[PDB]
């Protein structure tokens, strides 16, 4: 009944989060995580992210900064609060405070 | 939020480096970790917070106990994978507050 | 003595020279320092181009990644080992096949894990280690049937001998994959030690120490990692290889062990392991037990090169190059994550 | 001649950068000059 946590990041980050204990397979065996390999494209990331948001039990969603930049339009379109989306750093790209969808609401920063 | 993002800037880095060290001993355990998912050991519970007349949704960090990665480094990973598990649990503890 | 000096070079002398030449190309301490002094992964490749590695990484995309470097190192070692195996004869062919069984074990574990989770075996193939490729087609197009996969392993895989430790295919869904993997590895290590002993001579003399240390370290780490788990002592003792020097009452004391202090007390009786456990401070900022065992393993594999007429050179070279690839990947990780503080944790070789 | 190796000697040349290319080209044509690495500290791939 309680919500889950979802991950969209590089294989290493996804592995670390699974070790943290975030993944599960529901009644229909849908995973709540994705590894963004080079074989995966922007359309695939957008589709899986939209599925994540539509799912009512997802709760928190985590995305690497570069993946969030790649699929930024969907992040900005998503306006409701409950699907708490977070942008996280990665070894590939560092995290920067600027250009964060949540921080877009702030000018006093 | 700004402070928590700054602190994540370090917690996530520490967790990622713990993972890099884990790959030093345990080898390529990412595929095993991703394949053996079973059931989430950590779930979230919705909570209500009140400011003036406005209700602010918040989250609760809650455990299930249905561990599925025990013995993962039984022979080679061991301590490094256990430390990595702890670091990413700490990172999840940070990110739930952030959410 | 077997007098291998007389006949070893009849069949395996050219490969002995070839593998020693390959070993001469493993990065030395000066090369490791040079790579450590780099700043970016591009500079890492630049410095590495001066070593035996050469242009193995020139073709790949300019935005280098630790993943790309690791895969290229794995591919290079796979190519070299496959060339040696293709040029090897019967006894050394069996030795090299035994070397590859180690990765075939992990690959079959991956296959069964995916199949029990109803995932395509053909789609599981790419994640398998190249050195343990299941070129046999009996274990492909299995239709996601664990029974069919077990029959395929038994019929068309060198792991049929090690799968008799189990009792039936229901064991695949009954026992945890880690226990399956470690039972398979115990059986494989025991068979490998038996084969080396039967080969005898300088091969046995220079190889049995390495397998013995492997058995002892497997015992120690299994004990130390199974403390907080549901793995009972009775089911744990089944996972200790019997090749090690702990077989009389050492493995028994470990099985009865219920704490790291007890494991250390058991290790005390053997001075070689006593030093490793003493140096394994295990607190942040100092070498861990796994790192000490890696150092000892590298030392043993290097001492394997003081004998001449033996096959242990090939196993030692494979393990030393595995360690070197791990070291280079670790250095690249430190460069990418900017964590230069721990950049010295790499275990040097030669 | 072939009785024993030719008298060999080191030499060093100062040559302005603009004319350096042409001068070394003339040397290449001549063929009696053997250069040596004078910046071994930095590898070839970074010169």
Curated annotation (Swiss-Prot), chain A:
Keywords: Cytoplasmic vesicle, Hydrogen ion transport, Ion transport, Membrane, Synapse, Transport. GO terms for cellular component: clathrin-coated vesicle membrane; extrinsic component of synaptic vesicle membrane; membrane; proton-transporting V-type ATPase complex; vacuolar proton-transporting V-type ATPase complex; vacuolar proton-transporting V-type ATPase, V1 domain. It is a peripheral membrane protein. GO terms for molecular function: proton-transporting ATPase activity, rotational mechanism. Its main location: membrane. Coiled coil: none annotated. Expressed in brain (at protein level). SUPFAM superfamilies: AtpF-like. It is found in: Cytoplasmic vesicle, Secretory vesicle, Synaptic vesicle membrane; Cytoplasmic vesicle, Clathrin-coated vesicle membrane. GO terms for biological process: synaptic vesicle lumen acidification. V-ATPase is a heteromultimeric enzyme made up of two complexes: the ATP-hydrolytic V1 complex and the proton translocation V0 complex. The V1 complex consists of three catalytic AB heterodimers that form a heterohexamer, three peripheral stalks each consisting of EG heterodimers, one central rotor including subunits D and F, and the regulatory subunits C and H. The proton translocation complex V0 consists of the proton transport subunit a, a ring of proteolipid subunits c9c'', rotary subunit d, subunits e and f, and the accessory subunits ATP6AP1/Ac45 and ATP6AP2/PRR. Subunit of the V1 complex of vacuolar(H+)-ATPase (V-ATPase), a multisubunit enzyme composed of a peripheral complex (V1) that hydrolyzes ATP and a membrane integral complex (V0) that translocates protons. V-ATPase is responsible for acidifying and maintaining the pH of intracellular compartments and in some cell types, is targeted to the plasma membrane, where it is responsible for acidifying the extracellular environment. This is V-type proton ATPase subunit F. The gene is Atp6v1f.
Swiss-Prot record, chain D:
Belongs to the V-ATPase 116 kDa subunit family. This is V-type proton ATPase 116 kDa subunit a 1. The chain holds residues 3 to 49 of 838 of the full protein. Signal peptide: none annotated. It comes from Rattus norvegicus (Rat). It is found in: Cytoplasmic vesicle, Clathrin-coated vesicle membrane; Cytoplasmic vesicle, Secretory vesicle, Synaptic vesicle membrane; Melanosome. V-ATPase is a heteromultimeric enzyme made up of two complexes: the ATP-hydrolytic V1 complex and the proton translocation V0 complex. The V1 complex consists of three catalytic AB heterodimers that form a heterohexamer, three peripheral stalks each consisting of EG heterodimers, one central rotor including subunits D and F, and the regulatory subunits C and H. The proton translocation complex V0 consists of the proton transport subunit a, a ring of proteolipid subunits c9c'', rotary subunit d, subunits e and f, and the accessory subunits ATP6AP1/Ac45 and ATP6AP2/PRR. Interacts with SPAAR. It comes from the Eukaryota. Subunit of the V0 complex of vacuolar(H+)-ATPase (V-ATPase), a multisubunit enzyme composed of a peripheral complex (V1) that hydrolyzes ATP and a membrane integral complex (V0) that translocates protons. V-ATPase is responsible for the acidification of various organelles, such as lysosomes, endosomes, the trans-Golgi network, and secretory granules, including synaptic vesicles. In certain cell types, can be exported to the plasma membrane, where it is involved in the acidification of the extracellular environment. Required for assembly and activity of the vacuolar ATPase.
């Amino acid at each position: 009944r309680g919500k889950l946590i979802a991950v969209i990041g590089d294989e290493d980050t996804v592995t670390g989060f699974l070790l943290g204990g975030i993944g599960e397979l529901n009644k229909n065996r849908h995973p709540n995580f994705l590894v963004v390999e080079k074989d995966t494209t922007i359309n695939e990331i957008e589709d899986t992210f939209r599925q994540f948001l539509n799912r009512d039990d997802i709760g928190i969603i985590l995305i690497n900064q570069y993946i969030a930049e790649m699929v930024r339009h969907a992040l900005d379109a998503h306006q409701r609060s409950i699907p708490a989306v977070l942008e996280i750093p990665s070894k590939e790209h560092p995290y920067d405070a600027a250009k964060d969808s949540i921080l877009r609401r702030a000018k006093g920063m | 939020i700004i402070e928590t993002k700054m602190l994540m800037g370090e917690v996530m880095r520490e967790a990622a480096f713990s993972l890099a060290e884990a790959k030093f001993t345990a080898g390529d355990f990412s595929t095993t970790v991703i394949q053996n998912v079973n059931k989430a050991q950590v779930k979230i519970r919705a909570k209500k917070d009140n400011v003036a007349g406005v209700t602010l949704p918040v989250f609760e960090h809650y455990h299930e106990g249905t561990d599925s990665y025990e013995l993962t480094g039984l022979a080679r990973g061991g301590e490094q994978l256990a430390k990595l598990k702890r670091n990413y649990a700490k990172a999840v503890e940070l990110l739930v507050e952030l959410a | 003595s077997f007098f291998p000096e007389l006949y070893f070079n009849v069949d395996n002398g050219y490969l002995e020279g070839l593998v020693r030449g390959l070993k001469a190309g493993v990065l030395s301490q000066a090369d490791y320092l040079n790579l450590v002094q780099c700043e970016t992964l591009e500079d890492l490749k630049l410095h590495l181009q001066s070593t035996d590695y050469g242009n193995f990484l020139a073709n790949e995309a300019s935005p280098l990644t630790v993943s790309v470097i690791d895969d290229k190192l794995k591919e290079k070692m796979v190519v070299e080992f496959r060339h040696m195996r293709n040029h090897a004869y019967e006894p050394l062919a069996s030795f090299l096949d035994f070397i590859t069984y180690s990765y075939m074990i992990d690959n079959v574990i991956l296959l069964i894990t995916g199949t029990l989770h109803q995932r395509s075996i053909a789609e599981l193939v790419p994640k398998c280690h190249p050195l343990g490729s299941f070129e046999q087609m009996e274990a492909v197009n299995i239709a996601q049937t664990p029974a069919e996969l077990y029959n395929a392993i038994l019929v068309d895989t060198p792991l049929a001998a090690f799968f008799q430790d189990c009792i039936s295919e229901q064991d695949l869904d009954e026992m945890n994959i880690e226990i399956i993997r470690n039972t398979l590895y115990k059986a494989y290590l025991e068979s490998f030690y038996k084969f080396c002993t039967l080969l005898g001579g300088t091969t046995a003399d220079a190889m049995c120490p390495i397998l013995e240390f492997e058995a002892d370290r497997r015992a120690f780490i299994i004990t130390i990692n199974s403390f907080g788990t549901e793995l009972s002592k009775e089911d744990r003792a089944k996972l200790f290889p019997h090749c090690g020097r702990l077989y009389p009452e050492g493995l028994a004391q470990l099985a009865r062990a219920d704490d790291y202090e007890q494991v250390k007390n058991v290790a005390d009786y053997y001075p070689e392991y006593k030093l490793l456990f003493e140096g394994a401070g295990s607190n942040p900022g100092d070498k861990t037990l796994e790192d000490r065992f890696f150092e000892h393993e590298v030392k043993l594999n290097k001492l394997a090169f003081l004998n001449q007429f033996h096959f242990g050179v090939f196993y030692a070279f494979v393990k030393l190059k595995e360690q070197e690839c791990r070291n280079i990947v670790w250095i690249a990780e430190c460069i990418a994550q900017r964590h230069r503080a721990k950049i010295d944790n790499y275990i040097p070789i030669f | 001649e072939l009785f024993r190796s030719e008298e060999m000697t080191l030499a060093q040349l100062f040559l302005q950068s603009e004319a350096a290319y042409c001068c070394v080209s003339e040397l290449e044509e001549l063929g009696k000059v053997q250069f040596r690495d004078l910046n071994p500290d930095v590898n070839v791939f970074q010169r």
